[PDB]
Amino acid sequence: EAGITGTWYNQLGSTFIVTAGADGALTGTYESAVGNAESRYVLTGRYDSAPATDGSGTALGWTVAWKNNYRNAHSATTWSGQYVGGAEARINTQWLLTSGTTEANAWKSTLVGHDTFTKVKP
Amino acid sequence: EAGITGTWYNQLGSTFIVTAGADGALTGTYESAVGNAESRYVLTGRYDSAPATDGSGTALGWTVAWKNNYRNAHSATTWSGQYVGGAEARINTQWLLTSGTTEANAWKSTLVGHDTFTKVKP
């Protein structure tokens, strides 16, 4: 009923496949535009499993740490946003990408950006 | 009354000296913790020159582009925050540092962080 389980695509070629559990869990995989095994990472997060019924979106967030069995970029991204249902459902998000740094390099530790995901590729 | 004109120091040792104009202008200089002429850059911004009288802070923001007559880091930082008056006045901020990039490197264009400024050095 949540509308969130399934495959989502951002506007630059990445794909994530998630299950929205009855308990508020988000679990799945995030795959970069490269599209290989090396390019797939574990995704884990949470969502509001009882959203408002007034037309408001469904709040959610998730994390990917950029380590898999093939590669490690010593970093993790969090996406914070909301699911917006209807004819062309969307997940609108802002993200923070933190890389592990020394204290001297902490100034350059955290990048910020945004993503919009749809159930259909760009 | 406004409380903003003067010298402010962040927790890293940087120093800014600002004038808060009657018209809402912020003008001054930002000097990194190194403290020399090559470390000083023009600061320009805006503030609420008629803040609420209910104990709220005074909203403000400013920009430094990291070019001076000595050096150019092809980047600019904005700080967004509010002035909080009282016994130990503070300016609490969040910042965005954007570097000029190619389109392919735009993913790493914008760093985010925070700064707390006080009238006394840390």
Partner: peptide
């Protein structure tokens, strides 16, 4: 120049 895996494109 290295592109982080979040943003990496096919060659």
């Amino acid at each position: 120049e290295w592109v982080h895996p979040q943003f990496e494109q096919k060659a």
